[PDB]
Amino acid sequence: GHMFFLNLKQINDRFNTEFITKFKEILESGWYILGKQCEKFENNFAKYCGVKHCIGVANGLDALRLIIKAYDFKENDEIIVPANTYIASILAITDNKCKPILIEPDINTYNINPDLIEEKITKKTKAIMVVHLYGQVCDMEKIQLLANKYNLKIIEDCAQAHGAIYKDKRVGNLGDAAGFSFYPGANLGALGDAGCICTNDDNFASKIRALANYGSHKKYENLYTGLNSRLDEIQAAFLDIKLKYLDEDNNKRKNIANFYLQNIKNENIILPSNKFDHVWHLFVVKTKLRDELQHYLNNHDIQTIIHYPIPPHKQKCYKDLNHLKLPITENIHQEVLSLPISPTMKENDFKKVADILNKWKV
Amino acid sequence: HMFFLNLKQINDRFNTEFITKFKEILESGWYILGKQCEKFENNFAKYCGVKHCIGVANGLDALRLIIKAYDFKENDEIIVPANTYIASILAITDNKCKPILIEPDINTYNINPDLIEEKITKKTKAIMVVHLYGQVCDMEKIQLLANKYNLKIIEDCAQAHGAIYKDKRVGNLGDAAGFSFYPGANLGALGDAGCICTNDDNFASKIRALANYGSHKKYENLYTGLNSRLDEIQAAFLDIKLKYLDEDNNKRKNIANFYLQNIKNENIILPSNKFDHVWHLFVVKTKLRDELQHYLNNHDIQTIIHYPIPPHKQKCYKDLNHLKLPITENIHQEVLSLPISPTMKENDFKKVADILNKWKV
Numbered sequence A: 001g002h003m004f005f006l007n008l009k010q011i012n013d014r015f016n017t018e019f020i021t022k023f024k025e026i027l028e029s030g031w032y033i034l035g036k037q038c039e040k041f042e043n044n045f046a047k048y049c050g051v052k053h054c055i056g057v058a059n060g061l062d063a064l065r066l067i068i069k070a071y072d073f074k075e076n077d078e079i080i081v082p083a084n085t086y087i088a089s090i091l092a093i094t095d096n097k098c099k100p101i102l103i104e105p106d107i108n109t110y111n112i113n114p115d116l117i118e119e120k121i122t123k124k125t126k127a128i129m130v131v132h133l134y135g136q137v138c139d140m141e142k143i144q145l146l147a148n149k150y151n152l153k154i155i156e157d158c159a160q161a162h163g164a165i166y167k168d169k170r171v172g173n174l175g176d177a178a179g180f181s182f183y184p185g186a187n188l189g190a191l192g193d194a195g196c197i198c199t200n201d202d203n204f205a206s207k208i209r210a211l212a213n214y215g216s217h218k219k220y221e222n223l224y225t226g227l228n229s230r231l232d233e234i235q236a237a238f239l240d241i242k243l244k245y246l247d248e249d250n251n252k253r254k255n256i257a258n259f260y261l262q263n264i265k266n267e268n269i270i271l272p273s274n275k276f277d278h279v280w281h282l283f284v285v286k287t288k289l290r291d292e293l294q295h296y297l298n299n300h301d302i303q304t305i306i307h308y309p310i311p312p313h314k315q316k317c318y319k320d321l322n323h324l325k326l327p328i329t330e331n332i333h334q335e336v337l338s339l340p341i342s343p344t345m346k347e348n349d350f351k352k353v354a355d356i357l358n359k360w361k362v
Numbered sequence B: 001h002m003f004f005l006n007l008k009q010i011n012d013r014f015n016t017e018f019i020t021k022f023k024e025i026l027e028s029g030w031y032i033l034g035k036q037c038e039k040f041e042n043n044f045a046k047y048c049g050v051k052h053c054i055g056v057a058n059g060l061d062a063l064r065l066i067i068k069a070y071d072f073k074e075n076d077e078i079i080v081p082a083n084t085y086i087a088s089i090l091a092i093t094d095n096k097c098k099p100i101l102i103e104p105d106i107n108t109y110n111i112n113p114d115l116i117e118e119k120i121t122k123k124t125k126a127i128m129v130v131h132l133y134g135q136v137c138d139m140e141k142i143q144l145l146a147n148k149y150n151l152k153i154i155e156d157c158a159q160a161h162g163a164i165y166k167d168k169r170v171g172n173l174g175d176a177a178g179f180s181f182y183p184g185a186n187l188g189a190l191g192d193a194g195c196i197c198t199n200d201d202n203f204a205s206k207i208r209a210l211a212n213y214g215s216h217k218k219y220e221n222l223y224t225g226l227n228s229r230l231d232e233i234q235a236a237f238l239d240i241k242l243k244y245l246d247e248d249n250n251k252r253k254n255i256a257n258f259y260l261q262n263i264k265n266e267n268i269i270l271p272s273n274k275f276d277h278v279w280h281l282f283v284v285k286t287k288l289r290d291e292l293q294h295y296l297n298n299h300d301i302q303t304i305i306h307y308p309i310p311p312h313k314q315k316c317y318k319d320l321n322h323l324k325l326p327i328t329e330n331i332h333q334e335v336l337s338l339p340i341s342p343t344m345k346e347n348d349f350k351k352v353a354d355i356l357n358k359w360k361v
């Protein structure tokens, strides 16, 4: 009777018979890499997102690295990016020897404040990486206009936001290219590492396929210096099984999130009231007594994880960014904690979380 | 047709254990960095006779991460065979190091140790040896050069799982080793897979971190790392098959001996095994290579070339295209790989040799 932050066994148990059937199918095929399962999943995910092309790759960090690589930007080219995202977003930029330009989020969305972007555009700016953090779509309209004004690419980091909708389009189809994680804890999660890239652009999709296959378009030839970043047939099959339920799963997460938003009332806690569509990958509360809170919940047998306690600019791997004054970002990092949420989470369990938080006197 | 490498035949031996372990993983609810990875790494370490194994995502990553971990300066030089698979070279260029390409010995298909020293400079930091097609490289002189010049030895073991040199396995012949477990490798996964082996405690720890976003500890990033991990599922399939690896290699040894004792065609140069050879690939050499591939295909025998375009001649490496590497070039024009796999049937290998003997040009 410890309540786990995210019980993947529970989430995945509904599909066990299907997983096994597809695994046996793959065994029958004797094809485990770049086969029918990958094609099939790609086609179905591209349809889900409303895009022309989907390329399965190895994980969500590789998805962003590849996208950036394929644009073939110059050394020290600038990519604008929220300061409060998960570090992988920044790793993708610096791996490619681009310079990240870190922008404060809006305190009431946790996503990049669009009104703070233009002042930081320079003649070296080549792209804006938006991140739909925690499951909430970014307010894209201003960002798309800005990108057009200054001839910049929009790269969406969709790792946290599978299926969210801005006005008339899905996340994934709000920019020039989109990277997804299908890490097992994602809203659409694999049974292993996995990711993809989405795009409408024919040439970019062909370049990405090559770049993810050693740089080889054609057996024996390497047009580019590429890398090995592929989505295994088995993970593709698992993903495709689960994709048929993703809209349903997300709406169920919405139901749970709305219960929390409506039932948790504590002067010590700021709830993540959404300003745009939110698929609630993470249900993030904010409190001045965050470490006290995590211990309190642990004492009542409720497991929590912080997303996140150290922001990228303050990591030891980025000592050249440590000086940056980003107080909204820093404050968020000091105050946030994520509460358990999943599409299969039991009523007793979410009822318990709300009740226990309401009783909390700090 | 006869397939070049029939992975269904190779993997069928293990279906019931694969499905059992798959179900075990499902029951565990854990798919990344769990007990299956730990177990496989511990066993593969024991198998190579090394202290540490780090499961990573594929053989290129394995090499990229070893070089990344050394923290070489831009344009630092890495000595490497000119005739290896391009991924060996990609690992070096990805790290902004300069590949210094050395001709192989025609009698080994491996880097000629006698051609190394003359290419060492103040910028040389490493030698990447490749144990090509399954044969261990003649390390005696390479180790002496590495000691003399304070160079790292990086082994690319993607084609030579389990090969032996003196008292040691490939993987334990240098500072650090990368392996592929791509499904066609002598130990193959059902998906992309790799590992790194080393004896150095600090380096092993650094590699773990660098392959997990640069994080040693949850929430913290010491290094600007990558995501390159060996899935639980794959680790489990690997560990099931590892118990049969020496047996599988010996089955290859048998087929290669059949070929060697039975193919007698003046148009074909057969491979030799000067040192231990696990025969990942059984590479013949002819001036009429395209002709032979087509002839074999007419006779329902599938073959692949390893390889027909060398790294320096590739479009991606335009700045290398002018390099004069005639031994490597001639090998690329003339080599063809024959079907060999541990489960290959007697009638199939007999047919390959009979058909080669009948090739009359």
Ligand SMILES: Cc1ncc(COP(=O)(O)O)c(/C=N/[C@@H]2[C@@H](O)[C@@H](OP(=O)(O)OP(=O)(O)OC[C@H]3O[C@@H](n4cc(C)c(=O)[nH]c4=O)C[C@@H]3O)O[C@H](C)[C@H]2O)c1O
Residues within 6 Å of the ligand: A004, A005, A006, A007, A008, A009, A059, A060, A061, A062, A085, A086, A088, A089, A131, A157, A159, A160, A180, A181, A182, A183, A184, A185, A194, A195, A305, A307, B029, B030, B031, B032, B227
């Ligand atoms: C904005 C953004 N961009 C790019 C990326 C990069 O994508 P990637 O390369 O695919 O990681 C991320 C990754 N983002 C996530 C990141 O948010 C973080 O998430 P986390 O919630 O801290 O992850 P976790 O604690 O490992 O797992 C969450 C829960 O799930 C349980 N679990 C987990 C596993 C693996 C299991 O097998 N069984 C379980 O029961 C344990 C936990 O309760 O770390 C991950 C490793 C990244 O993939 C991102 O947020």
Ligand SMILES: Cc1ncc(COP(=O)(O)O)c(/C=N/[C@@H]2[C@@H](O)[C@@H](OP(=O)(O)OP(=O)(O)OC[C@H]3O[C@@H](n4cc(C)c(=O)[nH]c4=O)C[C@@H]3O)O[C@H](C)[C@H]2O)c1O
Residues within 6 Å of the ligand: A030, A031, A032, A033, A228, B004, B005, B006, B007, B008, B058, B059, B060, B061, B084, B085, B087, B088, B130, B156, B158, B159, B179, B180, B181, B182, B183, B184, B192, B193, B194, B304, B306
């Ligand atoms: C020295 C050296 N260093 C680093 C590396 C990099 O390692 P990596 O990143 O793990 O690839 C290699 C890779 N080396 C190999 C390289 O030699 C080459 O091998 P190849 O024999 O041309 O490979 P292939 O034709 O894709 O597969 C071989 C046969 O297996 C059949 N098959 C294959 C698959 C995937 C399947 O699912 N089912 C099948 O039935 C088809 C073919 O008949 O290309 C591969 C992609 C690399 O992993 C190397 O040789």
Ligand SMILES: [Cl-]
Residues within 6 Å of the ligand: B298
């Ligand atoms: Cl004929």
Ligand code: NA
Residues within 6 Å of the ligand: A058, A193, A230, A232, B057, B192, B229, B231
């Ligand atoms: Na993988």
